[PDB]
Amino acid sequence: AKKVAVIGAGVSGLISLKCCVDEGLEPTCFERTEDIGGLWRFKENVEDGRASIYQSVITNTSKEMSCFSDFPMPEHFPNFLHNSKLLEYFRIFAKKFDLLKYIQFQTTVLSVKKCPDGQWEIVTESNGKEQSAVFDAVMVCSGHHILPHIPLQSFPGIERFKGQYFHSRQYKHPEGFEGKRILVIGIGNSASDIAVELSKKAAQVFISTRHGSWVMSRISDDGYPWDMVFHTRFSSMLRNVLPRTVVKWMMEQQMNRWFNHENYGLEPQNKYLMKEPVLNDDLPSRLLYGAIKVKSRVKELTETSAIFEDGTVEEDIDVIVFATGYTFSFPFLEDSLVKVENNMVSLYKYMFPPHLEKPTLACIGLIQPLGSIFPTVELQARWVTRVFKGLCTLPSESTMMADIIKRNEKRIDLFGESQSQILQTNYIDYLDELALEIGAKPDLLSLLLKDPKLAMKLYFGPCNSYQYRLVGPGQWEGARNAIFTQKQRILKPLKTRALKALLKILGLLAVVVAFFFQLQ
Amino acid sequence: AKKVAVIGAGVSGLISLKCCVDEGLEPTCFERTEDIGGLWRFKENVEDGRASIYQSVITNTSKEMSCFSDFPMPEHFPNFLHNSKLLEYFRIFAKKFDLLKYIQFQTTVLSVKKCPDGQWEIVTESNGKEQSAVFDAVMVCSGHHILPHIPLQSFPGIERFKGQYFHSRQYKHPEGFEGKRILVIGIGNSASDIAVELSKKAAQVFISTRHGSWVMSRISDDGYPWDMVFHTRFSSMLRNVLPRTVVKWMMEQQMNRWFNHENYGLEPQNKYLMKEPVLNDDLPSRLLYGAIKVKSRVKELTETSAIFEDGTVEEDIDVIVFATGYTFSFPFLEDSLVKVENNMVSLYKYMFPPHLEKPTLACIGLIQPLGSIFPTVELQARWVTRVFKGLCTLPSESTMMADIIKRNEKRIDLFGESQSQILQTNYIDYLDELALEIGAKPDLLSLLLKDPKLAMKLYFGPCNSYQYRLVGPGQWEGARNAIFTQKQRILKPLKTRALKASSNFPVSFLLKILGLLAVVVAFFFQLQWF
């Protein structure tokens, strides 16, 4: 393998592009649009084949918990990021790794067909007329938050509903919805952001759910980003090992510290599930202010109103917003290639079509982890480039089919059977999976004997992307360094005004048990 | 006394108006503007002689912690309120007590002058031509968040600063300031609300302070409003009695639960002070997002930039906003009457000019308590109507002057010497002061041999306005009731989605864990005779 194709200059495109030149492959990037970023490049209109965002989106993951393993975000960056500002990182990245030269913009990939397999033929239209070409391998990075899902079938009377309705996709700005009566269906992270945003200047906003999530702020312990508090090796273990109830018993408590979810009305049904909680710093407040009313699932619609699953009714609702998420297709692909059946994607680790005989194509970024996607797709590409070169090997088709089932089977009893969780996956565990396959997973215990400082920090502290550039192939020296100095780059954009100026309670109770244990 | 004048149809006007008809006085209300509410009536332009608000203001006190003692907010109201919605309560109130008939709108009070004292002569212009009249007593309710303070003298180079600047007062909407570099001066509750609002669609927002407050969310324990968790008789006592540090040591911890204030950069200088913390549910987040940068005090301005007290500089700042608060005047009053000198208002309990020989005039609402103003001005008016009638008596001038000093002296060592705290006052303590004067303050000790349920609830639970309509004059039956059922009226607008599930096995955590540890101490304490 040498000549590699990457579909889209997404985040996933941009990192694979880079992970290629690192394994010395020579890649070609095809971008439908005129620029990089994919979803995170905000545009005012909703252009086809690209994922839209509303203008005000902020990331739900820390910069030091979601940068590429060898490229910390500038120290002067905020810890959570406007879409504006994330883009900037991406641009800074593609400048610093000269990845822009491999990109062909406004060239959309129409078909990816197998030649007599170990290569692929790829048709791509440009200005009207459509060239073809041949590649040894191909990495798909065309995203999956593009094709809206609106299950109107399950909302009867929608046919009768006068007034306006649309899908989260189509939203961009709140202006236009001044003082209207607005029903948003579902408790997406997006639904929440939307609800909140519209709620300010709107008559009323409702927000339907049967299930109703746990809501959680990006702020955590001592105002540090939640991901660095929650995503820590040691903690992940406890979540895995402890009896599921003991864990649920703990989520319940931790989650309710902010507010009683029963009272605010979004207490879940099955707390059994480790379903992704929504990340909105604004929602609980906006509920107190009465800007938003949470509500049970819509049962039926009328021309002006909505009946609900708990018998209540909401009169004169001017606007419905279906934040009912997206589905996904690969309209340029053998329909048997990315087989998606009975609430299960048959791809070895959300990546490799198992029925292939030469392992020369993989989907990157077709995954929804519980941490940042950016370090996941980086590792996804470290694995995949090395597979392509042969440095790494897949198992048998029958082994790969056994995994796929067993994974997705656990996945189900861990996040429920909804086709909005197909791609849900525990965060660290998966990073580890990918890192093992290329032997970049640090062996913490082994790091006890040498550098017990690191050993501790890696286990008990926050699990950064940096950790994975410690051992195995492609290392970064600034990895020990990055990890040790993250606190600095966190506080740097925060502690922006300075004063200049449990101390003895800690010394005492420790010594007082050093008195307990000694006087024997 | 009978014919009473109330200057302004503020909240203060509207409650006194009511407190009058309750003591059978016949009042006349003079309203500069065309409608009630004063500050809380949002209008698009900043109309003179009335306090302006930006359009998006939300009350920073609970509905059940800030309703009038005998008029709960409707159950279907949210717990914190848009200005839009608070007005509604006020309107509902003035309808239910027929207070609207006493109001003369678009009649502004030009002078209040003493006749041969025990009455007052009051000139009021209407449409052009200005009638005079006479009243036995007069209650001033013209507010004090109207006259902007902008100490430009202390911000040198402001003369040189090109680009735009103005005062909090004149703010209304954020649209217009898209992607600009905006410096707001001070950490007002307002500054914060403004900063936050502008910050969303702005290039950058900074926010200057030397001192820098504690920031606090309206959300508290178990998502209940902060005021009902903080303003509780029992707790107030601990704050009063415990060594001031022990109390500071406690505020510091409680406050930082949300976030480390050192790290976010608004750690205060003197934590010694029980200074009012800002109430913004948005500010800490908006700092994480980097929408707002906190900064030390401005030292100097240039045409395009700002130097700062810690040597830093911020280039290309398009807009300064002075959220540097308000002062206050009474332009229709004897200059000797409301004497305001050396960081001290000489009014007996922020109310009565002591040099008066007949006690026939009082200011209501010239006070900034640490809880809701609405129950304070209600009690302010219960005291005052009764003074006017003679049912209640002031002490001597020399006694009233001794209090005033002693109060304002404590006030200083409790909130610092800044002329932005003149009117600061502990919340419950003051409610008690006013209630005592008319003997409506419940005695709990007594109230423990009868209704120990109430006795507990009153002390340990949240100190509502309702409490004060339990004893003394003007009672409400729906007072025991209101208090007992408040949890309902709180949850009613919240718990709007409901599970339906008798939780034993799946989710009833500290139900049996409480049963166990209580029985396990019923084992601890008993097993001494075995």
Ligand SMILES: Cc1cc2nc3c(=O)[nH]c(=O)nc-3n(C[C@H](O)[C@H](O)[C@H](O)COP(=O)(O)OP(=O)(O)OC[C@H]3O[C@@H](n4cnc5c(N)ncnc54)[C@H](O)[C@@H]3O)c2cc1C
């Ligand atoms: C509201 C929201 C918030 C999120 N927040 C976070 C967060 O805080 N942290 C985090 O880690 N993740 C987050 N994510 C997830 C993740 O970052 C995004 O899904 C991510 O942008 C996906 O990037 P991608 O490159 O895989 O897809 P995209 O960015 O959509 O890339 C698709 C690219 O492919 C191009 N394309 C499509 N079809 C073709 C074709 N035939 N030929 C050529 N080009 C084509 C498009 O033009 C586009 O440039 C969030 C997602 C959402 C919806």
Ligand SMILES: Cc1cc2nc3c(=O)[nH]c(=O)nc-3n(C[C@H](O)[C@H](O)[C@H](O)COP(=O)(O)OP(=O)(O)OC[C@H]3O[C@@H](n4cnc5c(N)ncnc54)[C@H](O)[C@@H]3O)c2cc1C
């Ligand atoms: C931003 C902000 C938020 C606040 N939030 C809260 C809160 O959440 N909870 C709380 O308890 N308190 C709060 N307060 C404190 C308090 O509610 C307000 O200060 C409120 O204005 C008090 O009303 P008032 O009647 O004293 O004064 P105002 O409402 O200012 O009364 C002025 C009225 O008198 C009239 N008037 C003035 N001069 C004359 C004249 N010469 N003749 C006739 N009429 C005249 C005016 O036209 C107007 O009708 C807040 C204050 C501010 C600034």
